[PDB]
Each structure stands twice: as structure tokens, then as C-alpha cells.
Amino acid sequence: NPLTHSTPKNFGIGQAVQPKRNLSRYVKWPEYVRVQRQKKILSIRLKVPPTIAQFQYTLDRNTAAETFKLFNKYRPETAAEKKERLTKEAAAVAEGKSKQDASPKPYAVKYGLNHVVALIENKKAKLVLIANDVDPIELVVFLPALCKKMGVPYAIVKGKARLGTLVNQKTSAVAALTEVRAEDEAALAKLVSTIDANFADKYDEVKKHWGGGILGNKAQAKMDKRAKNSDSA
């Protein structure tokens, strides 16, 4: 009111400099950004073969949460914990005479791609987790097939870094169980079951399904509106 005034402003072409807006949709990202985005895009426009694309189908947050909860107990020794265990055994064994068995038989998760493979081959794993990332995918593409034929229950899980957190590596490609306390044997059969139900059981069917072939939405709408009008007038 005062000596103050409502002036509005006309931004309708041919008048008033346009105001500041969010041009984020328009900014000219660095080539490296551009490339990693179009890698994602090109990678879906192509029809992808069924031995890839059995990935993309990842374990879900709920089941997976339960499947970390279990594993997270079974982490491998910490550096201190081993130092600690050594001195425990280095001392106690060599004198109290113990058979280098003043240590308890350890239960931890098994890891490293090459390790886990031979475990599968030897029917020793009971639950193999495979990461959904992994950039030279070949490292891991054969694992579903592998598990399935060794009759090993598996799941393709979101997060190679998260497989890393539970093993103190930056990333871990694969994580597996082979051992387990009787206290946990139970929830493991349960965990395994859901997991088989989404993967190993669904494996043979997934294997027939190509993926991708997906339009961007500017040319989705193009055909969603071409196909709405043309046929049903």
C-alpha cells in the first residue's frame, strides 16, 4: 500500500528481459558426463541379449536388507583382530603347547572372484551374492549359469561397493557364505528360499528374454499418440 506500488512485469516475447530460470536441462555438460549418460542410453536402445539383462533384475531392498543383516555378522578379521589373535595364539600355543589350535575355527564370508568360483565348482558355497555393476561384466556373467549348474543358490545384488563394505575392501564384485553358526543356519534357509524364488527358479525363463529395445520419451510419446489416434478413431 504505502507509497509502494504493484508493477507486475510482462515476459511475453518482445518485451522484458527474460528472468533467471533453471536451464539445468540445457547446460552443456563436460564430454565425460555426456559420454556416461549416453552409454546408459545407447545401452538400452539396443536390444540386449538374455545372458546380459538377467542382470538389471536385482534383489529387492527388503530381502537384500535381510541378506546384509546376516552377512554383516560374518565379516572377515580386522587388522587389529588378527594382530590380537596372533599374539593370543603366538604366545599361548608355543608354550601351553596347544596344537596351533588355541584359535576357534573361524566363520567368515568368502570373497574375491576367483576364490568364490572354485567354491561354487566344489559345491561349497551356500549363498553366492553377485554384484549388478562390475564393468567388464564378463568377470561375472557366467556366475548365474555356474551356480545354477552346480545347483548353488545365488542372487544378483545392487552394489559392488556394498559387497565391499562388508569385507573392508572398496568394492568386492562377489560375496559368499559357505559356513555358518547353528544360530544362523535357520534364517539362511529362509534367506536362500526367497532368493532362489527370484533367480535360480526363474533362471531358465529369464534366459529366453532379451532386454532393452526402449524408446526415449520424445519418441515414446510420438508413438503413444500415433498409436492412440490412428487405430481407434
Added chain:
Amino acid sequence: GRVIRNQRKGAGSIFTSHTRLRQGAAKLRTLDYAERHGYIRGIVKQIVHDSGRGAPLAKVVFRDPYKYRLREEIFIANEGVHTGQFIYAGKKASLNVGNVLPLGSVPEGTIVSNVEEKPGDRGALARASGNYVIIIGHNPDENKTRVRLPSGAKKVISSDARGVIGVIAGGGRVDKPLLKAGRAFHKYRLKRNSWPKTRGVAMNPVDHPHGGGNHQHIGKASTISRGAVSGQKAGLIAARRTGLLRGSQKTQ
């Protein structure tokens, strides 16, 4: 023998254009948001001579829709446009001399200049003093528009090709006899080093297909084939006929 004249032109040593005095390139506005949804007003601030060009240019200044400032464009002036005039560029603009409009929004028979071959190439067809192009059709599905170029050729382009209503200014320039050598001289002095022209037939054989002989003569047909090769193509390249043209031309 030697490399003939028309082969040395390509390396552009003494052969580049004489550029120092030219006003700048002549171009329509960048086909931005204003021009393709509505129109935008400008003012021709000056219409002016471009060295080595037939037709005068028109400095036309507009407002920047995005910054507080004046961005000035260089147009080729259509006959009639004037200092002070307001120029309107845009889809939804009106049909008077000087304005710039997408060939879509002009009835057939409209007469426009500086037209784009594809939308937004900032102007490509009929720019020479005198020249223009006439819209002869439209095909609203796949919005094409058909025009007759100055040559005589008819072509079709996007209806979003922009043109400018009118003809290019300074026409008739070519009706005035040059009269003397010196005027051609000063003519090409502001163009390129293409004048005068020694006849190939006054040269020696190292110099030319046409060189040599105890009298001056071409000594073989001067209609050369398309398939011919550099050093061979002097004369009537790919000529599909030859001789004095008789009776009305004009394409049918």
C-alpha cells in the same frame, strides 16, 4: 607440362578473396525462441555499401531477450526498406517488405529474399542484387513449401525456412556497360584476383590444353567430359548442348 591456371586457383595463394573492407557476413537472426513462436521488432539503423557486393546491406538492431543489451544484425537490404523502419522477424509476423517470415506463413505468389535451404541456416538463397524467390506451393503434411529460385530451378524446403519479403536492392546493376578495362579492373580489385584473362589458346602447350600450334586453335572439341581429370577440364565442361541459343528459353 605445367599446372594450368585453373588448378592453381585451389591453393588460394594470390587467389583468396579481398576481404579487408567488407562489412561482415550477411545473415538472418539466429532462429531463436522469439522468431519461431512469435515475432520480434528491430530497427534498420543504417543501410550501407558492402565492398565487392552488388546490393547494399542493412544494419538492423534488436533487443536481447535474455540480457539487457542491443544485438545488431546484418541483413541484405530489400528494395524499399529504410533507415528508421521497424523490422519484424517471426512465425507470427506480418506480411510487409522487410520482415522475415517462415515460408509456411506466406501465400503462394509471395516474393521473398535471402531464404534458408534448411531452417535456421541464417539465409542462403537469392542474395544477389536484383534476385528473389517466389513461393509456388505448400504441402501442410510434412510442412514443405515449393519455390522457384532465381536460376529457374524449382526446389522444396522446410516451411520453417525463413525468408524476407521483397526483392534484393540495387537491381539492374548489370545493364550498364562497363565501357572500359579500368572499371572491370576496379571491379575485381574488390573481389578476387580473377582479372584479366589470358586465353588458353594464346598460351604454349605446357600452359594449357589449348596451347600451341602455328595458328591459334583449340584443335579438339572444347566440350570436356565430367569424368575428366584436373588439368583437362578447360572449355565447355559437361556441355549438353552448344552453339547460339535460339528462341525463348524460360523453363516450363
Added chain:
Amino acid sequence: KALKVRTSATFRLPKTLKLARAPKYASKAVPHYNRLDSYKVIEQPITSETAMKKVEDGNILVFQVSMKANKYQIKKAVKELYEVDVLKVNTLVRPNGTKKAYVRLTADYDALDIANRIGYI
């Protein structure tokens, strides 16, 4: 939640931390001693007869002086080496490629007096 909000459509190289040099060994062990002290600046008197004349008539000391050295450096080095005040200092390169400084003393000083105190005549 959601994304950023760039209002410009040009992306620029982030202004990232420029750390300064903290070596681990020294550049050269022992810094060079002053490469152009007054004794190296002002080389000899010039005692050509015509130079002597500038000394008796002009209150000017004429020195052959380091090529490497400038009008500031010549001035300060005379000022320092000879207890004297200086008005202005013209210089020139001689044709045997050596530098001559005409050095004008202020009106308090008698350069001629000061000539036979440095000890030339």
C-alpha cells in the same frame, strides 16, 4: 531429494583447492650472494681529458659502470661508496661496449674535490 539449479547454461571448471609448495629438500643449498654490489656496479673512474673537464666545470663524476646495472643502481652505489648526494645520472653505452655514467652531484658537493679524494687527477 532432488537436483541442483544452474541458472547459466555454461558449465565451468570448479574452483578447486590450489595447494602451495612445501618442498622436502632445498632449491640450491646456499643462496647466491648479491650478484651486483656497489663494488661490482661502479667499475672505474673515467679520466679522459674531456671527462676531467666535466668534473671541473660540471660537478659531474664520470664512471665506467657495469653494463648489467641501471640508473637507480648506479645512483645508489655512488651514494653509498662515496658519501655523496646525487642529482641525476645519465648513462650511455660506449662503442667498446662498456657503460659510462655521467653522475651529477647536488650543489652541496664539489665533485672536483671529490675526485682527488678518491684519488685521480
Added chain:
Amino acid sequence: YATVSKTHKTVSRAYGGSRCANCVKERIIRAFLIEEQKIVKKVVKEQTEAAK
């Protein structure tokens, strides 16, 4: 011109040492009239809208 006092570089009137008086006279009239005629345009088309 950087060695001379600012009165050598202007005349007092709006747009002093930049535009030529008669020219300022002119743009003032034009400014006033257009802004006035502007108001005319608005109340006339406000009328159109409620009488059509």
C-alpha cells in the same frame, strides 16, 4: 579529455554531452506521447473484451 575538467565534457541538460538537444527535445515528446497512447490502447482493448 582526461586532462580537462568535466564541464569541458558536457552541457547541463539531460543527456548532456552525448545527444544534440533538438534530439532530446524529440525523444521526450515521443516518450510522453507513446506512454500516453499506450494507456489509450489498454483501456480500449479492455473495452473490446467486455463488449464482444
Added chain:
RNA sequence: GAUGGGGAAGCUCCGUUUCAAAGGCCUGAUUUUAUGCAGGCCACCAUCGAAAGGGAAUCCGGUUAAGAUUCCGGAACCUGG
């Protein structure tokens, strides 16, 4: 004619703002303290290329065997602080 680049077995050739994450000014925030962050800009993209083109500002008198719009005398002017 360097540069992200693209050619070429390679000596090197092409490109010069070019399919590049290209850079820096004003002061504010410091009163641990010397300068981090706070804005807001500006996106101009090397550089070399004129002793006849462009261009801040000096004149007279006097003086030397040989310098002088350069020294001496007097009297000015510009640029930075």
C-alpha cells in the same frame, strides 16, 4: 603461430576458438591472522607481426675538436604515486 585436439611410420601436417571442465576483477568476510570464504559480476581463449599506419607528454637561448628537441640555462608538460 603455441594450446584440448584430428591426421601422419615418422621428420611433422591440419586446426586458432576450433566437437575443450580453458580463466580473474572488485571489494566484502579477518580484528586467532594473514588473507580463507561471502556475493555479484565479465566469458574477452594465447602469442608474434609497423623505427612510414594507430599513439600520454618540451620549448627557446647557449655550449663542443667531435653530442645535443638528449648537456648547461631558463621556462613547461604528461603519467604513476
Added chain:
RNA sequence: GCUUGUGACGGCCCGUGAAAAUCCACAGGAAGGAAUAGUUUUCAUGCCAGGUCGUACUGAUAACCGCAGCAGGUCUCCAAG
């Protein structure tokens, strides 16, 4: 009158006869500012400073290029009766 400088004009052109550094002005109004005393260095006066390299002479029927103190060649300013 002569040489030169400059002005307002006029003829000419299908020829209409550079660029950049740099300087100023204006539009704008962010801001900062008085009465117990504030604002102002585009007014005057006053203080300090101004580096580096070239500077001699010849420029021609002997100081340059023509084997040379060669009747050749080699860009220009000043101009009395």
C-alpha cells in the same frame, strides 16, 4: 604571387575508399553521506618519482649494392631573385 596548411562546397564510382590499443561522455541509481557538523580531489596550490636499448658519421660520379674511390643502381622532407 609561391610553397604548405585548413575550411565550407562541388565531380566521380558495378571503386563509396583499415584495425586495434586507448581516452572521454552519457543512460542507470548500488550505495555512501550534514548542523554541532559532514560530503567532496574531474576547482586551485602543494610532495615524490619516471627504468631498459638506439643516439657519432655517410646516405652517394669515394662511407650502401654492382670483385673497386665503377659515368650503373638505390625510399624521402626543406626550396630565393
Added chain:
RNA sequence: UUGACAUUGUGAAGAGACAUAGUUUCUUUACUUAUUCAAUGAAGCGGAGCUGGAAUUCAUUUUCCACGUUCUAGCAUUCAAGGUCCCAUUCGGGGCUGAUCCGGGUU
């Protein structure tokens, strides 16, 4: 220059054989991510919506266009004035709105 092979992928109709099930191969004509070409200090794209309204209603909307600028050689910039919510009221300052949503495919 002309052909073949490789770069080379996705539909659809049509021909072509085991000899009238569809693995395969070409003619046509679709698609876009390869490849190609223009553009711009990658600025306003594609989709939906508000409003208006032409439109004619065979239950009610079945749609289509629009959806801030054209007497004048002016002026158009300080995240925008207005409106509204906060800070603990200081001067300053900050959201939201003004300027509608959704997809980050610069066109």
C-alpha cells in the same frame, strides 16, 4: 566412377525354399542409438494442464485451434515491484509466489 564385402542395427507389408507351419534371404517404408550434417555464450524442447473460444451436443464433452508485443528512429539491467511466510526485529537478510505441472533427449 561402378559393384561387392565390412562399418550395419530395429519394426512392418510383399516376394523367395525344406516341398502351404516359419529359422533364412532380398524389393518396398517405417524406426534411432551407430554413422552423417547444420545450429547456439547447448534458453524455453516433448508431454500433460489451466484459462478463453470456434464448434454440435444425441448424455456430456466426442474434438480442433488459440492460450501477454505492430500509428511514432523513446524507455525496457541491480535474484522484480506487488502479495505472503520466516529471523526474533536494525540495517540487513532468507524462502515461496509472482512466472503451472511432469521427463533432465541442448535444438
